[PDB]
Amino acid sequence: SFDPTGYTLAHEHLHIDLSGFKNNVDCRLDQYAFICQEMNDLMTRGVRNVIEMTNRYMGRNAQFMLDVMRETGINVVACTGYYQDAFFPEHVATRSVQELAQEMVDEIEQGIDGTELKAGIIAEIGTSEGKITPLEEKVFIAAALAHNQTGRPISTHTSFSTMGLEQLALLQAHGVDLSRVTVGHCDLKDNLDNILKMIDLGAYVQFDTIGKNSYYPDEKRIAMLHALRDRGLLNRVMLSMDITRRSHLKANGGYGYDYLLTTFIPQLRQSGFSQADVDVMLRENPSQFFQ
C-alpha cells in the first residue's frame, strides 16, 4: 500500500470530470495511457504515492485508479467527500449532516464506486472564495463527524487561498485534532500571515498549485517556502501540482506531474534548500500525515 520510502504528491487528480459543469472536455481528465505514462515518469524521480483528491461527484473513477496502480506500481490514495457550493449535487441540501457523514464513513470502510478500493482520506472538502456557505459548513461538519469515527485525515480546498483559518476553527469546534487536517491551496497569493497562523494552530499547509503561474508565480511560492524554512516550519508543509486538465499533461503540450521534480524542486534547491529540506516536505511529512 502506502510506501513511506518514496515521495508523495499531496494533492492530485488522476481521473476527474468537471466537464459537465463547464462544457469543456479539457476538464475531463481521463486519458488513461497518458496518465499511466506520467505516473511512470514520477516513479523514476522517486515518487511512490499520490493522494487523489477527486471525490464522488467530481467524477471519481475507482476502477481507473486501480488500473493505473496495476499498470505502473504507483500507490494511489483515494478520497471521499463533497467539493464546494457551486458543484454540490442537489442532495447535499436535502440529506442530513448525519447521512452525509455516514456516506463518507462507508466509502472509507467498505469501498468506493463498487470496487474493492476504499477511501483513505476525507477530501477535497472546499469552501468558496472569501466565504463558507451554509452547505459548505454542513459538509465540513459531516467531515468532522466522519473523522471522529474513523480517524482518517481531512484534506481541504481553499478558493484562491481564502478561508483556511475559518475552516480550521470550524473543524476544531467540532472536535477535530487540527494535526489531522491539511489545508489545500495556500499558495495562490502572498499568504504568509495566514499560513503562520494555521501552522500555529497545529494544521499542515499545502503549496499544491506549483506550476500555475498565471494565478501566482512559482518564484513567490519559493519565497514563501524560504520564510517557512527560516522559521523551522518545514515539518508542516506538503507539496503538489493539483493537475486537473488534459492540457496539463505533457502529451498535450503541458508540464505534467513530474514538473515538480524536473523543474520546481531544482529551482528550490538552487535558491538554497538542501535535499534533506526537500525530503522533509516530500517524504517525511506525507508518511507521518497520510498513514
What are the residues binding Zn ion (CB under 5 A)? 53, 124, 157, 242
* 124 belongs to an annotated ligand binding site: yes
* Coil/strand/helix, residue 183: strand
- The sign of the dihedral angle between the CA atoms of 261, 263, 265, 266 is positive
Record the cell numbers describing residue 242, joined without a space: 493539483
* 208 belongs to an annotated ligand binding site: no
* 269 belongs to an annotated ligand binding site: no
* 245 belongs to an annotated ligand binding site: no
Is 118 or 245 the residue whose CB approaches Zn ion more closely?
245
- The sign of the dihedral angle between the CA atoms of 96, 101, 105, 107 is positive
Element (H, E) at 243: none
* 177 belongs to an annotated ligand binding site: yes
CB 31 → Zn ion: shortest distance, Å?
17
Residue nearest to Zn ion (CB): 157
- Residue spans of alpha helices (H) in the chain: 19-22, 32-44, 62-72, 91-94, 97-109, 134-150, 164-173, 192-200, 218-230, 259, 265-270, 275-279, 285-289
Is 124 or 277 the residue whose CB approaches Zn ion more closely?
124
CB 126 → Zn ion: shortest distance, Å?
6
* 113 belongs to an annotated ligand binding site: no
CA–CA separation, 98 and 287 (whole Å)? 31
CB 151 → Zn ion: shortest distance, Å?
23
Is 72 or 159 the residue whose CB approaches Zn ion more closely?
159
CA–CA separation, 95 and 97 (whole Å)? 7
Is 157 or 246 the residue whose CB approaches Zn ion more closely?
157
Q: How far apart are the first and last CA of the chain?
A: 10
Is 156 or 273 the residue whose CB approaches Zn ion more closely?
156
Q: What residue numbers does the annotated binding site for beta-D-glucose cover?
A: 147-148, 175, 177, 180, 279, 283
Q: What residue numbers does the annotated binding site for Zn(2+) cover?
A: 11, 13, 124, 157, 185, 242
Q: What residue numbers does the annotated binding site cover?
A: 11, 13, 124, 147-148, 157, 175, 177, 180, 185, 242, 279, 283
